[PDB]
Amino acid sequence: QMVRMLDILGDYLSIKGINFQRLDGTVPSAQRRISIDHFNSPDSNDFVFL
DNA sequence: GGATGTATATATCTGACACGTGCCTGGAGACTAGGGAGTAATCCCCTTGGCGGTTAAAACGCGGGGGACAGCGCGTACGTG
Numbered sequence: 769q770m771v772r773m774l775d776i777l778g779d780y781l782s783i784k785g786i787n788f789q790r791l792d793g794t795v796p797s798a799q800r801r802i803s804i805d806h807f808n809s810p811d812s813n814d815f816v817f818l
Numbered sequence: 819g820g821a822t823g824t825a826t827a828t829a830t831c832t833g834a835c836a837c838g839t840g841c842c843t844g845g846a847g848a849c850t851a852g853g854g855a856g857t858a859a860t861c862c863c864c865t866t867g868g869c870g871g872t873t874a875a876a877a878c879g880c881g882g883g884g885g886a887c888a889g890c891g892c893g894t895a896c897g898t899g
Contacts, residue, residue: 793869
């Protein structure tokens with residue numbers, strides 16, 4: 769529900785070292801479509817989507 | 819032998835203090851009423867965290883030219899006696 773908790777988990781997976789992608793209200797629709805197509809690709813190395 | 823600087827004693831000024839006195843204004847005691855504290859209900863406004871979309875305002879870069887500022891002359895108006 770909070771994007772600051774999304775920032776907390778994003779930094780947790782960043783120092784943890786897990787390929788993560790993110791979507792919230794600050795992200796414009798072009799990068800949203802880019803992240804959705806990147807997560808749904810068959811050769812995606814992304815593991816967790818926020 | 820005459821004239822001069824310092825030292826203790828007495829009279830006078832001068833603000834402060836002890837005493838006197840009035841009186842009036844503040845304090846002690848009692849009573850009362852009402853102003854304010856507390857409670858409950860109802861409804862509207864504000865808080866914190868989010869989202870979406872428009873779009874006009876804000877930010878940034880760059881040319882250039884208008885204006886701020888420094889320097890110099892002068893003559894007159896103000897300082898000074």
